[PDB]
Design a protein around this motif. Sequence first.
Motif, PDB file in Angstrom:
ATOM      1  N   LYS A  14       0.874  -1.122  -0.200  1.00 52.95           N
ATOM      2  CA  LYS A  14       0.089   0.061   0.123  1.00 52.95           C
ATOM      3  C   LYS A  14       0.712   1.253   0.030  1.00 52.95           C
ATOM      4  CE  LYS A  14      -3.187  -2.829  -0.156  1.00 52.95           C
ATOM      5  NZ  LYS A  14      -4.538  -2.734  -0.624  1.00 52.95           N
ATOM      6  N   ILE A  15       0.999   2.101  -1.201  1.00 52.95           N
ATOM      7  CA  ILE A  15       1.977   2.923  -1.406  1.00 52.95           C
ATOM      8  C   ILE A  15       1.111   4.229  -1.659  1.00 52.95           C
ATOM      9  CG2 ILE A  15       3.800   3.776  -2.814  1.00 52.95           C
ATOM     10  CD1 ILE A  15       4.274   0.703  -3.422  1.00 52.95           C
ATOM     11  N   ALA A  16       1.305   5.488  -0.809  1.00 51.32           N
ATOM     12  CA  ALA A  16       0.435   6.515  -0.931  1.00 51.32           C
ATOM     13  C   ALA A  16       0.977   6.936  -2.449  1.00 51.32           C
ATOM     14  CB  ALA A  16       1.173   7.581   0.160  1.00 51.32           C
ATOM     15  N   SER A  17      -0.193   7.784  -3.225  1.00 52.49           N
ATOM     16  CA  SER A  17      -0.215   8.199  -4.389  1.00 52.49           C
ATOM     17  C   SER A  17       1.141   9.195  -4.685  1.00 52.49           C
ATOM     18  CB  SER A  17      -1.478   8.580  -4.984  1.00 52.49           C
ATOM     19  OG  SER A  17      -1.841   9.726  -4.122  1.00 52.49           O
ATOM     20  N   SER A  18       1.610  10.062  -3.396  1.00 55.72           N
ATOM     21  CA  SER A  18       2.540  11.011  -3.645  1.00 55.72           C
ATOM     22  C   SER A  18       3.831  10.344  -3.494  1.00 55.72           C
ATOM     23  CB  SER A  18       2.130  12.145  -2.781  1.00 55.72           C
ATOM     24  OG  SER A  18       2.348  11.540  -1.260  1.00 55.72           O
ATOM     25  N   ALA A  19       3.938   9.016  -3.186  1.00 55.44           N
ATOM     26  CA  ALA A  19       5.319   8.687  -2.956  1.00 55.44           C
ATOM     27  C   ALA A  19       5.946   8.263  -4.028  1.00 55.44           C
ATOM     28  CB  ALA A  19       5.521   7.231  -1.981  1.00 55.44           C
ATOM     29  N   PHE A  20       7.317   8.594  -4.340  1.00 56.15           N
ATOM     30  CA  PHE A  20       8.147   8.291  -5.427  1.00 56.15           C
ATOM     31  C   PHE A  20       8.846   6.856  -5.283  1.00 56.15           C
ATOM     32  CE2 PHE A  20      12.699   8.484  -6.770  1.00 56.15           C
ATOM     33  CZ  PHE A  20      12.501   8.243  -8.182  1.00 56.15           C
ATOM     34  N   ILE A  21       8.463   6.007  -5.897  1.00 55.97           N
ATOM     35  CA  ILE A  21       9.065   4.620  -6.162  1.00 55.97           C
ATOM     36  C   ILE A  21       9.967   4.675  -7.358  1.00 55.97           C
ATOM     37  CG2 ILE A  21       8.828   2.059  -6.153  1.00 55.97           C
ATOM     38  CD1 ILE A  21       7.619   3.672  -3.670  1.00 55.97           C
ATOM     39  N   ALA A  22      11.342   4.529  -7.237  1.00 55.38           N
ATOM     40  CA  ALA A  22      12.459   4.709  -8.492  1.00 55.38           C
ATOM     41  C   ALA A  22      12.283   3.481  -9.379  1.00 55.38           C
ATOM     42  CB  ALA A  22      13.575   5.028  -7.618  1.00 55.38           C
ATOM     43  N   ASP A  23      13.091   3.525 -10.213  1.00 62.14           N
ATOM     44  CA  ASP A  23      13.215   2.362 -11.168  1.00 62.14           C
ATOM     45  C   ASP A  23      14.111   1.437 -10.539  1.00 62.14           C
ATOM     46  OD1 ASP A  23      11.960   3.443 -13.683  1.00 62.14           O
ATOM     47  OD2 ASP A  23      13.510   5.118 -13.232  1.00 62.14           O
ATOM     48  N   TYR A  24      13.802  -0.044 -10.899  1.00 62.73           N
ATOM     49  CA  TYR A  24      14.249  -1.232 -10.652  1.00 62.73           C
ATOM     50  C   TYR A  24      14.386  -1.180  -8.727  1.00 62.73           C
ATOM     51  CZ  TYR A  24      16.902  -0.135 -14.971  1.00 62.73           C
ATOM     52  OH  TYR A  24      16.813   0.135 -16.169  1.00 62.73           O
ATOM     53  N   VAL A  25      13.181  -0.865  -8.276  1.00 64.48           N
ATOM     54  CA  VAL A  25      12.842  -1.067  -6.915  1.00 64.48           C
ATOM     55  C   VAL A  25      11.922  -2.125  -6.971  1.00 64.48           C
ATOM     56  CG1 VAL A  25      11.215   0.051  -5.173  1.00 64.48           C
ATOM     57  CG2 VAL A  25      13.151   1.484  -5.868  1.00 64.48           C
ATOM     58  N   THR A  26      12.071  -3.066  -5.969  1.00 63.81           N
ATOM     59  CA  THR A  26      11.134  -4.248  -5.791  1.00 63.81           C
ATOM     60  C   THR A  26      10.429  -4.087  -4.438  1.00 63.81           C
ATOM     61  OG1 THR A  26      12.236  -5.810  -7.082  1.00 63.81           O
ATOM     62  CG2 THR A  26      10.869  -6.614  -5.703  1.00 63.81           C
ATOM     63  N   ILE A  27       9.098  -4.079  -4.481  1.00 61.09           N
ATOM     64  CA  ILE A  27       8.361  -4.106  -3.160  1.00 61.09           C
ATOM     65  C   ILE A  27       7.373  -5.170  -3.189  1.00 61.09           C
ATOM     66  CG2 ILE A  27       7.085  -2.693  -1.578  1.00 61.09           C
ATOM     67  CD1 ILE A  27       8.066  -0.230  -2.812  1.00 61.09           C
ATOM     68  N   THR A  28       7.476  -5.972  -2.127  1.00 52.82           N
ATOM     69  CA  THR A  28       6.231  -7.095  -2.003  1.00 52.82           C
ATOM     70  C   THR A  28       5.589  -7.026  -0.648  1.00 52.82           C
ATOM     71  OG1 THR A  28       7.724  -8.709  -1.158  1.00 52.82           O
ATOM     72  CG2 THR A  28       8.233  -8.419  -3.386  1.00 52.82           C
ATOM     73  N   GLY A  29       4.456  -7.656  -1.017  1.00 56.58           N
ATOM     74  CA  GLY A  29       3.884  -8.131   0.569  1.00 56.58           C
ATOM     75  C   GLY A  29       3.394  -6.939   1.389  1.00 56.58           C
ATOM     76  N   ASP A  30       3.585  -7.169   2.721  1.00 58.92           N
ATOM     77  CA  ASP A  30       2.850  -6.544   3.772  1.00 58.92           C
ATOM     78  C   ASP A  30       3.791  -5.218   3.938  1.00 58.92           C
ATOM     79  OD1 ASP A  30       1.064  -6.398   5.817  1.00 58.92           O
ATOM     80  OD2 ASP A  30       2.283  -7.724   7.236  1.00 58.92           O
ATOM     81  N   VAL A  31       3.640  -4.129   3.165  1.00 61.66           N
ATOM     82  CA  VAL A  31       4.476  -3.120   3.022  1.00 61.66           C
ATOM     83  C   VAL A  31       3.466  -1.877   3.170  1.00 61.66           C
ATOM     84  CG1 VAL A  31       6.349  -1.899   2.165  1.00 61.66           C
ATOM     85  CG2 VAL A  31       6.613  -4.069   2.295  1.00 61.66           C
ATOM     86  N   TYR A  32       3.773  -0.669   3.635  1.00 61.28           N
ATOM     87  CA  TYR A  32       2.963   0.452   3.652  1.00 61.28           C
ATOM     88  C   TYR A  32       4.089   1.478   3.596  1.00 61.28           C
ATOM     89  CZ  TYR A  32      -1.135  -2.204   5.202  1.00 61.28           C
ATOM     90  OH  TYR A  32      -1.882  -3.268   5.005  1.00 61.28           O
ATOM     91  N   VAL A  33       3.845   2.579   2.664  1.00 59.82           N
ATOM     92  CA  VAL A  33       4.679   3.754   2.252  1.00 59.82           C
ATOM     93  C   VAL A  33       3.875   4.921   2.546  1.00 59.82           C
ATOM     94  CG1 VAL A  33       6.403   4.779   0.943  1.00 59.82           C
ATOM     95  CG2 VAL A  33       5.957   2.148   1.093  1.00 59.82           C
ATOM     96  N   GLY A  34       4.337   5.911   3.062  1.00 58.70           N
ATOM     97  CA  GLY A  34       3.377   7.078   3.408  1.00 58.70           C
ATOM     98  C   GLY A  34       3.656   8.080   2.461  1.00 58.70           C
ATOM     99  N   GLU A  35       2.948   9.151   2.624  1.00 65.96           N
ATOM    100  CA  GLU A  35       3.120  10.559   1.641  1.00 65.96           C
ATOM    101  C   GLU A  35       4.398  11.096   1.685  1.00 65.96           C
ATOM    102  OE1 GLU A  35       0.103  11.193   0.326  1.00 65.96           O
ATOM    103  OE2 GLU A  35      -1.200   9.916   1.487  1.00 65.96           O
ATOM    104  N   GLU A  36       4.615  11.370   0.456  1.00 61.88           N
ATOM    105  CA  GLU A  36       5.968  12.137  -0.063  1.00 61.88           C
ATOM    106  C   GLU A  36       7.080  11.455   0.428  1.00 61.88           C
ATOM    107  OE1 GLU A  36       5.400  16.106   1.588  1.00 61.88           O
ATOM    108  OE2 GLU A  36       4.737  16.743  -0.139  1.00 61.88           O
TER     109      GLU A  36
END
Length: 172
Positions: A14-36
């Motif tokens: 669950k990744i906030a719409s304002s978060a930046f997730i760069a190229d070649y990043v892998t995120i799996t499973g039970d992870v929450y990432v907040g705003e900005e």
Amino acid sequence: SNAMIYPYKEKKPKIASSAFIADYVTITGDVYVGEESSIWFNTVIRGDVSPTIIGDRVNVQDQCTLHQSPQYPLILEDDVTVGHQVILHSCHIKKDALIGMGSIILDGAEIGEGAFIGAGSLVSQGKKIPPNTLAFGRPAKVIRELTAEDRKDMERIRTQYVEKGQYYKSLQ
């Protein structure tokens, strides 16, 4: 943009719409990432042992590894800075702390609010670093209290990262 997002069993990141997730990043499973918050190039966050909770305006810099052991979650509170090539393993990093590049922070470790872990450090399992202190070494030891000047540089870094994250996000 060219990043991998996978479920782990029934949980999806669950990744906030304002978060930046760069190229070649892998995120799996039970992870929450907040705003900005910003997750930089080639970082891996596998949320397949315990939860990973990343707050708001957090930067996890390039080529980090974020994982867990069963007994503890991995928590990065608001306004945290995590340097390049850091390994985080079921630790709790409290708000405004900074983890120096190339460090390893192990299970059950607690990094106090606004503490600064020097580059290349190893914070052993269960180790508590008090708020507003500098700690470094392997295993890391508390060196001194931080100053107003240390805190101003930390503020510069975390705020610039928010801005830079939004900038690189705009190029995707």
